[PDB]
Amino acid sequence: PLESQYQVGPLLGSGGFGSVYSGIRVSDNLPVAIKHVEKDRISDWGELPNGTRVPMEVVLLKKVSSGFSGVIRLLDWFERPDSFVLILERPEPVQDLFDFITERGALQEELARSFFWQVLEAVRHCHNCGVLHRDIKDENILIDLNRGELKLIDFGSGALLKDTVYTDFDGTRVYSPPEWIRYHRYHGRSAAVWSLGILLYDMVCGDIPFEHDEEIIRGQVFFRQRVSSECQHLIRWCLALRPSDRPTFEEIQNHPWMQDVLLPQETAEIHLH
Ligand SMILES: N[C@H]1CCC[C@H](Nc2cccc(-c3n[nH]c4cnc(-c5cccnc5)cc34)n2)C1
């Protein structure tokens, strides 16, 4: 019975992903997040190592949950008649990147550098564990306001990482690559890099670069804020129209703009405290 193991708090939010509540594990008072997703709303299903029907999200989460905490870890999960309930780690105090950007405006490049680097590390961790997130965006990353550490959330649109083409997509369209818009086909890593380009622009400009399909397809970036030439270059590289023209993750992290990143703690002391 999960109803007695957890003290349910306020609704943190709801949307396509379902409904997520703040919670507290009664045994040790550990802060937690409680996510409800209706079975009717789940189209992507997977198999547990012990042979059982579970949402793919659970499968993916299990594969990425462990030491490296760039990703919010799954602590436990329950099946109900018409829904699944996930119990997830919850940092405190916390704010998602979307709200942070909204309230603070465009981020100083030193801050964006640290945040972007942490996201890259988190995404690399996922890929190394055979998991593709498919919905990297500011709304899906949490900021531990005390430690300056970022955490990736919501694998409800994710999939197992593969080297062949994806022909399905239920992520955020304005973060999706031109090859999806045009051909309904994309490969995991190169598509991820595109979304990262969108994210980086978002960090240093205060808003997303594209709104309509035609803009994504044209792939022309204009800067509304003062942004260094190095940063502009990295962004334009990630947003290359041709997937094969985009940088690998190693290439991104070796880019000149990516050098001399602050540690999470230093980042918090300077920018969050
Ligand atoms: N864009 C917003 C929409 C509302 C959910 C979320 N906000 C917060 C706020 C504090 C903690 C967590 C939190 N702590 N731990 C978590 C684990 N998973 C999720 C989550 C969010 C969305 C979809 N799936 C899972 C959220 C959390 N999430 C992000």
Same domain, 26 and 115: no
Same domain, 195 and 224: yes
Helix (H) or strand (E) run with residue 9 in it: strand 6-15
Is 94 close to ligand 1, i.e. is its CB under 6 Å away? yes
**Structural domain span for residue 53:** 1-92
Inter-helix orientation angle 97-104/188-205, to 10°: 30
Tokens coding 15: 């949307």
CATH code of 200's domain: 1.10.510.10
Give me the numbers of helices (H) and strands (E) for the chain, helices first please: 10, 12
226 and 192 Cβ atoms separated by less than 8 Å: no
Torsion sign across C-alpha atoms 150, 58, 64, 184? negative
* Closest by Cα among 74, 212, 67, 186 to 134: 186
* Closest by Cα among 6, 56, 54 to 34: 6
CA–CA separation, 44 and 57 (whole Å) = 8
Inter-helix orientation angle 188-205/109-128, to 10°: 160
Same domain, 85 and 169: no
Same domain, 40 and 152: no
Is 35 close to ligand 1, i.e. is its CB under 6 Å away? yes
Cis upstream peptide for 178 (omega within 30°): no
CA–CA separation, 219 and 247 (whole Å) = 16
The torsion angle over the Cα atoms of residues 25, 118, 160 and 211, rounded to 10 degrees, is: 110
**Measured between alpha carbons, how far is residue 153 from residues 28, 36, 260 in Å?**
23, 14, 26
138 and 96 Cβ atoms separated by less than 8 Å: yes
Residues 6+ apart with CB under 8 A from 173: 181
| DSSP β-ladder status, 83-89 and 31-38 | antiparallel
Same domain, 99 and 81: no
CA–CA separation, 158 and 172 (whole Å) = 12
CA–CA separation, 155 and 152 (whole Å) = 9
Same domain, 115 and 44: no
- CB atoms near residue 192 (< 10 Å): 26
Task: Give the number of C-alpha atoms closer than 13 A to the C-alpha of residue 202, restricted to the C-beta side.
Answer: 24
CA of 1 to the centre of ligand 1 (A): 23
- Out of 57, 77, 92, a domain closes at 92
CA of 145 to the centre of ligand 1 (A): 14
Residues 6+ apart with CB under 8 A from 229: none
**Measured between alpha carbons, how far is residue 84 from residues 56, 66, 87 in Å?**
11, 22, 10
23 and 8 Cβ atoms separated by less than 8 Å: yes
Report how this structure was experimentally obtained: X-ray
- Collapsing DSSP to helix, strand or coil, 78 comes out as strand
Residues 6+ apart with CB under 8 A from 151: 69, 70, 71, 72, 91, 122, 141, 142, 143, 144
Site to probe by mutation for ligand 1, drawn from 142, 149, 175 as the one with most ligand atoms within 8 Å of Cβ, is: 142
Give the distance from CA 265 to its chain's centroid: 21
Tokens coding 130: 């055979």
DSSP tag of 175: G
253 and 130 Cβ atoms separated by less than 8 Å: no
Same domain, 38 and 58: yes
Give the distance from CA 239 to its chain's centroid: 18
State the amino acid at position 32 in one-letter form.
V
Is 71 close to ligand 1, i.e. is its CB under 6 Å away? no
Total of domains in the chain: 2
Same domain, 167 and 86: no
- Out of 92, 118, 138, a domain closes at 92
Length of the chain (residues):
273
Same domain, 104 and 67: no
Helix (H) or strand (E) run with residue 15 in it: strand 6-15
Among the listed residues 40, 76, 99, 135, the single catalytic one is 135
58 and 77 Cβ atoms separated by less than 8 Å: yes
CA of 152 to the centre of ligand 1 (A): 9
Same domain, 11 and 56: yes
Decide: residue 20, CB within 10 A, 0-12 exposed, 13-18 middle, 19+ buried: buried
CA–CA separation, 44 and 12 (whole Å) = 24
Residues 6+ apart with CB under 8 A from 28: none
- Out of 92, 111, 134, a domain closes at 92
- Collapsing DSSP to helix, strand or coil, 12 comes out as strand
CA–CA separation, 124 and 59 (whole Å) = 18
Decide: residue 227, CB within 10 A, 0-12 exposed, 13-18 middle, 19+ buried: buried
CATH code of 54's domain: 3.30.200.20
Same domain, 97 and 69: no
Same domain, 17 and 128: no
DSSP tag of 224: S
